[PDB]
Amino acid sequence: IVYKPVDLSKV
Amino acid sequence: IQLTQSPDSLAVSLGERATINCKSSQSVFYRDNNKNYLAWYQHKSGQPPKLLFFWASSRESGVSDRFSGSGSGTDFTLTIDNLQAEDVALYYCQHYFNIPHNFGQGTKLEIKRTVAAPSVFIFPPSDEQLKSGTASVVCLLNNFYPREAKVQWKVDNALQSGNSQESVTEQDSKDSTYSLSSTLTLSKADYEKHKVYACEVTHQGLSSPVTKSFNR
Amino acid sequence: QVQLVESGPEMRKPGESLKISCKTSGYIFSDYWTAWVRQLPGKGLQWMGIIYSGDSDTRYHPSVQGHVTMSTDSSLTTAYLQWSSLKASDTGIYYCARLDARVDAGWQLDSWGQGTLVTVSSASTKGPSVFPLAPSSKSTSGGTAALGCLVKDYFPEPVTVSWNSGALTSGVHTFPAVLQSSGLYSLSSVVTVPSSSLGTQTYICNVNHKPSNTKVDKRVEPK
Ligand SMILES: [Cl-]
Ligand SMILES: [Cl-]
Both C154 and C44 in one domain: the answer is no
Q: Which of B85, B99, B101 is nearest to B38 (CA)?
A: B101
Q: Do C128 and C206 share a domain, yes or no?
A: yes
- Straight-line distance from the first to the last Cα atom of chain A, in angstroms, rounded to the nearest whole number: 28
Nearest chain B CA: its distance from A6 CA (Å): 5
B1 contact residues in A (CB cutoff 8 A): 2
| Buried b / exposed e along B152-173 (16+ C-beta atoms within 10 A) | bbbbeeeeeeeebebbbbebbb
Buried b (16+ CB within 10 A) or exposed e, C40-57: eeebebbbbbbbbbeeee
C-chain CB neighbours of B122 within 8 Å are 138-139
Quick check: A1 and B27 CB within 8 A? yes
Host domain of residue C35: 1-122
Alpha helix positions (H), B16-148: 127-132
DSSP B162: S
Query: Using what technique was this structure determined?
Result: X-ray
Using CB atoms, which residue from C57, C59, C102 is nearest to A11?
Answer: C102
In chain C, residues with a C-beta closer than 8 Å to the C-beta of A10 are 33, 52, 54-55, 57, 101
Backbone angles phi, psi at B34, to 5 degrees: 60, 55
Residue type for position C33:
W
Determine how many CB atoms are found less than 10 A away from the CB of residue B132. 15
Q: What gap in Å lies between CA C134 and CA C136, rounded to an integer?
A: 6
Sign, CA dihedral C56-C60-C66-C67, equals negative
Q: Which residue of A has its CA nearest to B97?
A: A5
Q: Count the domains in chain C.
A: 2
What is the C132 CA–ligand 1 centroid distance (Å)?
20
Residue C149 maps to which CATH number? 2.60.40.10
Query: How buried is residue C124: exposed, middle or buried, by Cβ count under 10 Å (0-12/13-18/19+)?
Result: exposed
Q: Where are the domains of chain B?
A: 1-112, 113-216
Using CA of residue C131, residue C134, residue C138, residue C142, what is the dihedral sign? positive
Task: Examine the domain organization and report whether C148 and C100 are in the same domain.
Answer: no
C109, C185, C189: best to mutate for the B interface, most B CBs within 10 A: C109
Cα–chain center distance at B208? 26
Of all residues in chain A, the one with the smallest CA distance to B25 is A1
Q: Which of C60, C94, C122 corresponds to the end of one domain?
A: C122
Fold equal for B1-112 and B113-216? yes
Contact between chains at B129 and C134 (C-beta distance less than 8 A): no
Superfamily of segment(s) B1-112: Immunoglobulins (2.60.40.10)
**Interface subset of A 1-11, CB within 8 angstroms of C:** 8-11
Q: Cα of B172 to ligand 1 centre, how many Å?
A: 5
Do C188 and C85 have their domain in common?
no
Closest ligand to Cα C200: 2
CA distance C48 to C163: 35
B27 in contact with A at a CB cutoff of 8 Å?
yes
Task: Please compute, for residue C27, the number of CA atoms within 13 A of its CA located in the half-sphere on the CB side.
Answer: 20
- Specify the CATH number for B113-216; select among 3.40.50.150, 2.60.40.10, 3.40.50.10170, 3.50.50.60: 2.60.40.10
Resolution, expressed in angstroms to one decimal:
3.0
